DNA sequence: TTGACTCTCTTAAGAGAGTCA
DNA sequence: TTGACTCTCTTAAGAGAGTCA
């Protein structure tokens, strides 16, 4: 809600239902060929799934506090940052999973960056395989790789150069 | 429908035409600080765009051809790819812009890839600074760096371990 | 047969808000 | 007040199809 103290207590009351979502350890590539371990803490399949969570799609979820008699509510990855700038440079800040798990709602595995730097982490080569990211990736980008284009580059004639 | 050859004719027209757009001269990142040289066909920003052509919306086109008074019309980058096929790993191939400009029609800068692979190529550090695309970047993506993150990972408490 | 417009849709990273009990 | 559902929207890489003369 509007104080800062009202705002504290929203992403306490998070933190600590969240920080009892079920444990779950995933091993991932970090990038040149090591692996490492993370540990997301996963929001339940199906309902309930925790005191102010509500799923709003298939993987969105949504959470809600009374606070001065009304509701207020958020998408359920954006609690940690409610005391940050929500734009950068006039485009809308998004919560971003570095761990790639969208069910994972670790504030340790969420960071607050443009949509575009969020997308972007999929196919970053991961913090040992050269990631650039100021906030750096957990893990490498599951998308990372050569591709499966199916043809390149080409032309029939001779009306083009490169 | 369309026979190989009536197929191959419609390459051959879109050619010819594409090549008579204006010829625009780009100096790009490739990455590892260096700096190339693009050459891009770009299709005008307003009617008439050339004999085959027509905007469909802000930044998208559409090529058409009457064969046996028959209209056949496709997306007008993905007319170097009509001999190719048009699925990969059960994803569709889509029109990708290795100069990143998207007014460009210059097959050479264009790739048949799934969508995922089109949009990687945003942040791939490029063909002189890491890239792994087995049909190789022709730049530095536009998006390659160490990004704009407002906040990141974070808690207030301890209930969390990354 | 052609040009110049019109409309809506796909994807996968993300959102806000209303209806009931 | 809290829970469990419903709906549509945003973005930026991409698409197909209709109308009129
Ligand atoms: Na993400
Ligand atoms: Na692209
Ligand atoms: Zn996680
Ligand atoms: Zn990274
Ligand atoms: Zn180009
Ligand atoms: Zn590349």
Chains 1, 2 share one sequence.
Do not use: M
Request: net charge positive; glycine share 12%; hydrophobic share 35%.
């Amino acid at each position: 809600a509007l104080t800062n103290a009202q705002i504290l207590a929203v992403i306490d009351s998070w933190e600590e239902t969240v920080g009892q979502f079920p444990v779950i350890t995933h091993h991932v590539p970090l990038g040149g060929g090591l692996q490492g371990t993370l540990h997301c803490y996963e929001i339940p399949l199906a309902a309930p799934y925790g005191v102010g969570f509500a799923k709003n799609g298939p993987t969105r979820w949504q959470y809600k506090r009374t606070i001065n008699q009304v509701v207020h509510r958020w998408g359920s990855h954006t609690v940690p940052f409610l005391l940050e700038p929500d734009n950068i440079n006039g485009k809308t800040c998004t919560a971003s999973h570095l761990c790639h798990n969208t069910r994972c709602h670790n504030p340790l595995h969420l960071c607050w960056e443009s949509l575009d730097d969020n997308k972007g982490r999929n196919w970053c080569p991961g913090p040992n395989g050269g990631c650039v990211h100021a906030v750096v990736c957990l893990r490498q980008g599951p998308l990372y790789g050569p591709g499966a284009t199916v043809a390149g580059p080409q032309q029939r004639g001779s009306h083009f150069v490169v």
